Enzyme design. Structure first.
Site, mmCIF file in Angstrom:
data_model
loop_
_atom_site.group_PDB
_atom_site.id
_atom_site.type_symbol
_atom_site.label_atom_id
_atom_site.label_comp_id
_atom_site.label_asym_id
_atom_site.label_seq_id
_atom_site.Cartn_x
_atom_site.Cartn_y
_atom_site.Cartn_z
ATOM 1 N N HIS B 166 0.535 -0.941 -0.094
ATOM 2 C CA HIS B 166 0.203 -0.023 0.199
ATOM 3 C C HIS B 166 1.365 1.117 -0.195
ATOM 4 C CE1 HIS B 166 -3.477 2.855 1.067
ATOM 5 N NE2 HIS B 166 -2.853 3.307 1.597
ATOM 6 N N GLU B 167 1.830 1.547 0.982
ATOM 7 C CA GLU B 167 2.637 2.370 0.787
ATOM 8 C C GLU B 167 4.075 3.107 -0.738
ATOM 9 O OE1 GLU B 167 1.750 4.299 3.183
ATOM 10 O OE2 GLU B 167 1.032 2.907 4.453
ATOM 11 N N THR B 197 -10.657 2.626 -12.157
ATOM 12 C CA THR B 197 -11.065 2.108 -10.798
ATOM 13 C C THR B 197 -13.054 2.791 -10.063
ATOM 14 O OG1 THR B 197 -9.695 3.875 -9.800
ATOM 15 C CG2 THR B 197 -9.081 2.065 -9.003
#
Ligand SMILES: CNC(=O)[C@H](Cc1ccccc1)NC(=O)[C@H](CC(C)C)[C@H](CSc1cccs1)C(=O)NO
Ligand SMILES: CNC(=O)[C@H](Cc1ccccc1)NC(=O)[C@H](CC(C)C)[C@H](CSc1cccs1)C(=O)NO
Ligand SMILES: [Ca+2]
Ligand SMILES: [Ca+2]
Ligand SMILES: [Ca+2]
Ligand SMILES: [Ca+2]
Ligand SMILES: [Ca+2]
Ligand SMILES: [Zn+2]
Ligand SMILES: [Zn+2]
Lengths: 259, 259
Positions: B166-167, B197
């Site tokens: 994620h990071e 998305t």
């Protein structure tokens, strides 16, 4: 027992008009010396229900007369840059990223002034602060030039010096009055950790009419005239005594070097 | 045309248990080399409805074998500290504030690992990133040890190495899938700048059931199994092709030094 804080203002400019005058900078210092001493005349705007809660923070500010080496200074640095905007990622606080290095944070309050500031996701902002305890390298406050001082490039409604008052509030460990809920959270669930600031849903913008009720806090409503809300400069006029307790703990603790 | 990113992991420890093992750190690297290659076995969990969109980002990671001076390194630094918690103010990224200095951001991905991380206002967090373009001094990602790797101190539900995925998505210029609206804004109004998305209201947490419809994105709903949502490790298993595009632009532009 007045705490006097040395200030250095780092003007970072791309275009000549952003290289703001001494007069503009001085006008901001003058405002801080009113707001942080309860000497602002618009303190008369506080609702009678809260008129006993207004605090004199007992803090004054002066442009530094000596630089970190002990040489005379005007307390203002001026740095030309090719950078066109800065962000909350602190590019303005390092010479290497087109800004200007911080002076020793235990001896000075660093204020950076630049033309354009954005959040990480590209939201236009007027300023941002670093809370106590962070690294000295990035300690201080950042305010855009059109929201700094009461003359020159300053533009209404941010032409009364309150953006800096708000950011220095953060620098002294104060939180947004409404509690900074994220969008998935109940708007009444978070606290600013101060008892005498009423529980409040969201930030107030612009020029609200009193009372502005939220979170069942009627009949008095939100203390939207607190510097730690988001109202126009002319509408924010006070810190509370509860906020003063936090500021004093900051001065007695992480920022004791200034005592 | 695989991009190979050299990594340095800065372990900052107060208690000896926080001085995490080589194996735990290695297990995180192994996860990255799966997630960023579409080699994670749990990619099978993606609703078949979006199988056409699942991306191989074509990026791999290795612990550096040469330090910034050209001397041999294990690619892991270990720094003892008296600091008991770090914040998003970047204390962990400076030796002066009880952390560890960044290695050159144009040559290494800096990953800091510490025991406790908080936001500015005291919220517990598992990790945070700096987006491209920021100052080199603070460039990289920070993850808490209990959410780093798949053995040792790693704890469920954050024991599959997805916090770092994620990071590093943020490090490569990807934004939260739901658009990061502020509390008072229409939850359908902001964009993550990726067409494929679906428009999404709010972050998803835990383990949602498919479908989770928001912002009239039915019948398929939110792509909550994307790494850039907020679901448990076991539930986030994919990047999209649209996100791969943004990432490629990051490597072609601000982070081209890695090419
Ligand atoms: C024209 N710009 C504005 O009026 C913006 C509007 C805004 C609000 C939230 C997020 C993004 C933009 N407000 C500010 O500039 C705030 C200062 C006030 C006193 C003027 C400022 C926001 S910093 C943040 C960035 C991201 C999350 S909080 C602040 O709180 N500093 O301490
Ligand atoms: C145990 N803690 C958590 O699960 C927190 C919960 C949380 C969410 C928002 C704000 C504060 C806390 N989530 C995170 O740590 C996020 C990482 C996820 C993928 C695990 C983390 C939040 S960083 C922020 C601080 C303030 C605003 S966003 C993130 O997005 N990094 O990129
Ligand atoms: Ca920073
Ligand atoms: Ca309160
Ligand atoms: Ca609130
Ligand atoms: Ca999208
Ligand atoms: Ca949204
Ligand atoms: Zn603020
Ligand atoms: Zn995130």
């Amino acid at each position: 027992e007045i705490v006097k804080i040395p200030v250095v203002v780092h003007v970072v400019w791309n275009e000549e008009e952003e290289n703001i005058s001494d007069a503009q900078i001085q006008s901001q210092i003058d405002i801080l010396n009113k707001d942080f001493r309860k000497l602002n005349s618009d303190v008369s705007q506080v609702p009678s229900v809260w008129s006993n809660l207004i605090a004199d923070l007992g803090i004054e500010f002066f442009l530094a007369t000596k630089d970190p080496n002990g040489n005379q200074t005007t307390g203002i640095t001026r740095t030309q840059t090719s950078v066109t905007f800065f962000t909350t990622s602190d590019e303005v606080k390092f010479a290497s990223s087109g800004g200007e290095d911080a002076w020793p944070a235990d001896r000075y309050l660093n204020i950076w002034v630049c033309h354009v500031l954005k959040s990480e996701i590209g939201q236009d902002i007027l300023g941002y602060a670093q809370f106590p305890g962070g690294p000295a390298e990035t300690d201080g406050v950042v305010i855009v030039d059109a929201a700094f001082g009461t003359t020159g490039t300053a533009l209404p409604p941010f032409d009364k010096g309150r953006t800096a008052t708000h950011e220095i509030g953060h620098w002294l460990n104060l939180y947004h009055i409404w509690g900074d809920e994220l969008r998935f959270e109940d708007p009444c669930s978070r606290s600013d950790e101060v008892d005498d600031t009423p529980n409040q849903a969201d930030p107030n913008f612009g020029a609200p009419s009193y009372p502005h009720v939220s979170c069942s806090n009627g009949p008095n409503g939100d203390m939207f005239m607190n510097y730690m809300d988001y109202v126009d400069d002319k509408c924010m006029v006070m810190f509370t005594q509860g906020q003063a307790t936090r500021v004093n703990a900051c001065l007695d603790g992480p920022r004791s070097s200034f005592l």
